[PDB]
């Protein structure tokens, strides 16, 4: 493990790799109480133990807390100059898209007030949509909140298009489908899981609550932590409960009648699962409060693998695109740790 300190007065809230855009996949953003900081990951000589070190590049000042953070495919590099596009959520309950050239915010769009969410925003994600001619036609941001609303915010050539959709319960996560921006997934706090075609009722709703194996009772309150697609065509869906209970469904052949596989993490997962970018069957989950991280294999290859235990709480974490490195933001730092097995 190598450890890289965040500035002394910087409290991290969120950590994400720029896996969404290959030109910028070595860019790391930390949303904190005064903005979003960008770091670069480089192969040093090091020892080929952790043959990867972190270089802090710069800090984008915003003046208020950043709670969720997503890079877009529009990110680019030039010589040098970084052209960034970031979706995030701020203390004023607004959802924003910030477009920068390095630390300087050259452009900013803000969706808030009554036109925005009418309660706390719980999650956000972003994807670039191109026309048939293949110019940038739209950038699309999806967000979910405690106002029982899902918001699709499309920024198009002739300007913004806003749409709201009602939910049976607070939205706790949202993510567009890989290799198919026409589809996306929305998570409700109550265990409902929506598959949605925004170009169009919405196509499908699964639910983890009634499926709990109950060989070991998952408890009275098993609030849904997370749902994410897996695979590079978005061939699968993985859902994780706060309790640690997880379930996986695949989407291809024949007729289907239950979720394909199911299990339970050793610990609660407040932050939910972070699926491996290269190995579908694998995902990571943290015991954020004691600072341990379990690695789970869906086809039970795993047998309780806990590669990571810190002596401190974990605020957030995410896989580097290479699949062997992990970046983890803790309350005062970010660690890059390399698991030798995944190399």
């Amino acid at each position: 493990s190598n450890q890289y300190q965040l500035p002394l007065n910087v409290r991290p809230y969120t950590t994400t790799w720029c896996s969404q855009s290959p030109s910028c996949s070595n860019l790391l953003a930390i949303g904190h109480d005064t903005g979003i900081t960008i770091y670069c990951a480089s192969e040093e000589q090091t020892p080929g133990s952790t043959g990867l070190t972190l270089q802090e590049l710069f800090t984008i000042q915003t003046g208020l807390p950043t709670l969720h953070l997503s890079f877009s495919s529009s990110c680019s590099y030039s010589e040098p100059v970084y052209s960034l596009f970031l979706a995030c959520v701020c203390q004023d309950n607004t959802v924003r898209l910030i477009i920068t050239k390095n630390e300087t915010i050259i452009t900013q769009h803000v969706l808030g007030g009554k036109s925005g969410h009418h309660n706390f925003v719980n999650d956000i994600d972003i994807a670039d949509v191109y026309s048939a001619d293949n110019r940038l036609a739209e950038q699309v941001i999806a967000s979910v909140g405690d106002d029982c609303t899902l918001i699709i915010w499309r920024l198009t050539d002739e300007g913004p298009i806003l749409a709201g959709y009602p939910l049976s319960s607070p939205g706790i996560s949202v993510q567009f489908r890989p290799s198919n921006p026409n589809q996306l997934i929305v998570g409700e706090r109550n265990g409902n899981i929506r598959i949605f075609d925004w170009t169009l009722p919405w196509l499908l709703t699964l639910n983890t609550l009634p499926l709990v194996n109950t060989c070991h009772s998952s408890g009275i309150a098993s609030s849904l932590a997370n749902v994410r697609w897996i695979g590079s065509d978005g061939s699968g869906i993985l859902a994780m409960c706060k309790s640690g209970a997880w379930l996986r469904w695949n989407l291809f052949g024949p007729k289907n009648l239950l979720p394909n596989v199911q299990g339970i993490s050793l610990f609660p997962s407040l932050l939910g699962a972070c699926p491996h970018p290269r190995y579908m069957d694998y995902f990571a989950t943290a015991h954020s409060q004691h600072g341990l991280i379990q690695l789970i294999n869906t086809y039970e290859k795993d047998s309780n693998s806990i590669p990571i235990q810190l002596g401190m709480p974990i605020v957030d974490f995410c896989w580097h695109q290479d699949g062997s490195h992990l970046a983890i933001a803790t309350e005062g730092s970010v660690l890059l740790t390399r698991l030798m097995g995944f190399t």
Binding site: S218, G219, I220, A221, S222, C241, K242, S243, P268
Partner: peptide, 13 residues
């Protein structure tokens, strides 16, 4: 019934 936390399940039960 609200899902999520282990203590949430505690309150629940």
């Amino acid at each position: 019934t609200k899902t999520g936390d282990v203590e949430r399940g505690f309150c629940n039960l």
